[PDB]
Structures are given as structure tokens and as C-alpha cells.
Amino acid sequence: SLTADQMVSALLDAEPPILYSMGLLTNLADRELVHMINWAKRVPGFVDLTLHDQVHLLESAWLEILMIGLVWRSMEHPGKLLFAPNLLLDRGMVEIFDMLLATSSRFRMMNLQGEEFVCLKSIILLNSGTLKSLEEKDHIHRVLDKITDTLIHLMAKAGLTLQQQHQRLAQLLLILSHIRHMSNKGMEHLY
Amino acid sequence: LTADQMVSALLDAEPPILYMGLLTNLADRELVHMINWAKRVPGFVDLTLHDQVHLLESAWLEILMIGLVWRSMEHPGKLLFAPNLLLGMVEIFDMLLATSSRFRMMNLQGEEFVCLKSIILLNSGHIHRVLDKITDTLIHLMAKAGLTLQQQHQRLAQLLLILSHIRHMSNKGMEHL
Ligand SMILES: CC(C)c1ccc(N2CCc3cc(O)ccc3[C@@]2(C)c2ccc(/C=C/C(=O)O)cc2)cc1
Numbered sequence A: 001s002l003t004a005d006q007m008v009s010a011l012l013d014a015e016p017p018i019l020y021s022m023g024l025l026t027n028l029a030d031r032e033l034v035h036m037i038n039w040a041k042r043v044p045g046f047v048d049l050t051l052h053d054q055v056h057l058l059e060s061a062w063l064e065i066l067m068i069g070l071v072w073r074s075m076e077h078p079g080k081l082l083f084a085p086n087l088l089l090d091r092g093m094v095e096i097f098d099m100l101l102a103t104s105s106r107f108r109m110m111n112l113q114g115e116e117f118v119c120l121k122s123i124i125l126l127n128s129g130t131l132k133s134l135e136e137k138d139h140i141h142r143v144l145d146k147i148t149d150t151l152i153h154l155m156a157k158a159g160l161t162l163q164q165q166h167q168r169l170a171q172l173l174l175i176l177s178h179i180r181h182m183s184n185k186g187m188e189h190l191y
Numbered sequence B: 001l002t003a004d005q006m007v008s009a010l011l012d013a014e015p016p017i018l019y020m021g022l023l024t025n026l027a028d029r030e031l032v033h034m035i036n037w038a039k040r041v042p043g044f045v046d047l048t049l050h051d052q053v054h055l056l057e058s059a060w061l062e063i064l065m066i067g068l069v070w071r072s073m074e075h076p077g078k079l080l081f082a083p084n085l086l087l088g089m090v091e092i093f094d095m096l097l098a099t100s101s102r103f104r105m106m107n108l109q110g111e112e113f114v115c116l117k118s119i120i121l122l123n124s125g126h127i128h129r130v131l132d133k134i135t136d137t138l139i140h141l142m143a144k145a146g147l148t149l150q151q152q153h154q155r156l157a158q159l160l161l162i163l164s165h166i167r168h169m170s171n172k173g174m175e176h177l
């Protein structure tokens, strides 16, 4: 029950702040998580799901959101990873850091817009992860369809051709496989 | 190439259906036909031998798994590893079945499946130009079918997002091995 400019607006407003600071990295993660739970609650369609589902969707995607957020602010800082404005870093942390830097290098070369980013951040949450179950998942795919055509509109309003629009949508969703990859390869070392 | 010559090449490149230790053997047998399939994928041989090795090093279980989900699409609640074999592995099987369940609910067409297999290979690692060409192919077939741009976009996106689930399954499975 929302339009394109209405989805980005809801999302941009729900946007968490840029906080300040391995022990550091964890205290920053534990603090970014709380603004994420609120950001998740403010996602158009998320609060609707029951507590057992909302927790699943967040346990499944919290390290991807932390990674895409990180890759977003580090974009204008080539070779560096801006975890916080007071915590700029560089080159199993190192391999993760390289992939993280590669993703950023890419996002910058793609000229990813803040409005296009907040869409991917939501896709990462709704995508990664009885009757209640079969009906919640149906609505989740409904929301994900809304966001696809929100992104397509953003691209259309940005004067891209019909081909460019398709070719960029696939380019962004294909990055979201690598972020899952970095997410999972990171959870490995955490455990 | 062209969008109809693409799907033509892709379908003619398709590996055959072969017939724990049981599956372990089957997997290594299918890895030979997959390297074979990889060479026929338009634009793969153009790459350097180091790239070709690393793409297969990364995609090998994803390629097996997407092929498996395709084989078990018409066999609900079961996994068709081979026609002579229909069945933390309990967790992986559960996730794989859900992918067939999803590909069934979405009516995955063979022409779309061969397109996704090439995307899994070339994306899990000139590569972007070919990836755009396979994108175009998936989009052209949805247009050929007669679907609207709103639905095309929906089908393209909902399909590629299953690729992220395929990596999770790969990662989990590779962790265990
Ligand atoms: C390979 C391994 C060493 C590794 C693990 C994780 C990470 N990530 C990459 C993305 C990212 C993004 C941020 O904004 C902040 C922090 C991070 C860290 C640096 C991060 C995230 C969570 C936690 C702990 C949680 C807990 O136990 O409470 C610690 C560090 C990078 C490398």
C-alpha cells in the first residue's frame, strides 16, 4: 500500500546514525545492532510478522546489514574501511577486509545512490531467511516485489534506458550473493 | 551472440544425468561433466586458466546443488541425486528441498535454469559483459513469453535472490566437508 517515492522516504527516515567507537569492533557491532532492530521495525512490512519470524529474519541477516553498511560509508575512502568516523582501517580478518574493500570499490564504480542502497539493506533483511509461516513468507515476497519495482522506478527517474534498468538491477542483486558469502565466511571465524 | 543463440548454446552445453560415500562418488563423477559444461558456457574459455580454476573452485557445490534442485522439482519431499537414487546433512537436505519447493511454486522453466547455472558460475568470483548478456537472455525469454515489464522485473529479481540462498547452502555444506 505504498508508491516508489513513499518507500525510499520511509527507508531514508528509518536510516540508523553513523556511530563512533577487535574489542572496539564488537562494542561498535553491539551498538549498531540496536539501531538496526529499530531500523528493521521501521521497514515497511516488517512489524506485521510475528516475534518468532522477526527474530529469525534478523538472526539470519544481522552480519550482512553490518557489512553492507560498512561497505557503504567506506565507498568514498578507497583502500580504507570506515567502521566509525573515528575508526578508519586497512588491509581471518584480512580476507574479509579485502572482499569488503572489493565490494566498496565496486559500489563506487557503480555510483550506487543512497536511495538504491536503503533498498538493498531491506532486501538483505527480507530475503535472507504451519499457516502463519506459509502466510508470512507470502507477504515477505509481496514486500520484496514492492522494493524491486521501487528500485526500478529510482533507476527510471534517473533516466536509465529499459536495458540499463534490468542490467543494474541484476548487478546489485548479484552483489548480495557475495555479501551473504562474506557474512557466512565471517560467522565461521566468530564461532 | 544473440538471446536465442545464447539459450541454444546453453541447452546444448547441458551435462548428462549420471547413475555418504555413495553421494561423495556421484559428486566427483558430476564434477568431470561440470568442468566439461563450464568450457562450453559462452565466454568461459576466453578467461585465463587461473580464473577458470577459481570460478570452478567457488561454484562447484552451488552448480551441483542448483542442478539437484532442478532434478527434484517434480519429486516433492524427495531429492533426485540420480534416477537410481531418490531420497549436518539433515539441515542441508531441508534447505535444498525448500529451494525445489520455491522453484516449483515459481514454475522454473528450463531455458531460465540454464541461464541461472551460468550466472552461478560466472558470478561466484569481460565477465560483467557476459553476465549482462545472460541477464538480457533471461529478460528476452520473459518478454518472448509475453509477461509485462513489472512482472519481468519481479521474475528477474525473485530468481537471482534464490542465488544468495544457494551460496548459503554451499558455504554450510563446504564448512561440514
Ligand atoms: C574474520 C572475522 C575476524 C571477522 C568477523 C566480523 C567482521 N565484521 C565485518 C563487518 C563489520 C561492520 C561493522 O559496522 C562493525 C563491525 C564489523 C566486523 C568487524 C565485526 C562484526 C561483529 C563482531 C562481533 C559480534 C559479537 O560477537 O557480538 C565483530 C566484528 C570482520 C571480520
Ligand SMILES: CC(C)c1ccc(N2CCc3cc(O)ccc3[C@@]2(C)c2ccc(/C=C/C(=O)O)cc2)cc1
Binding pocket: B023, B024, B026, B027, B028, B030, B064, B065, B068, B081, B088, B089, B092, B172, B173, B174, B176, B177
Ligand atoms: C552438510 C554436508 C555433509 C553436505 C555437503 C554436500 C552435499 N551435497 C549436496 C548436493 C549434491 C548434489 C549432487 O548432484 C551430488 C552430491 C551432492 C552432495 C550430497 C555432496 C557433494 C559433495 C560431496 C563430496 C565431494 C568430495 O569432496 O569428494 C559429497 C556430497 C550435501 C551435504
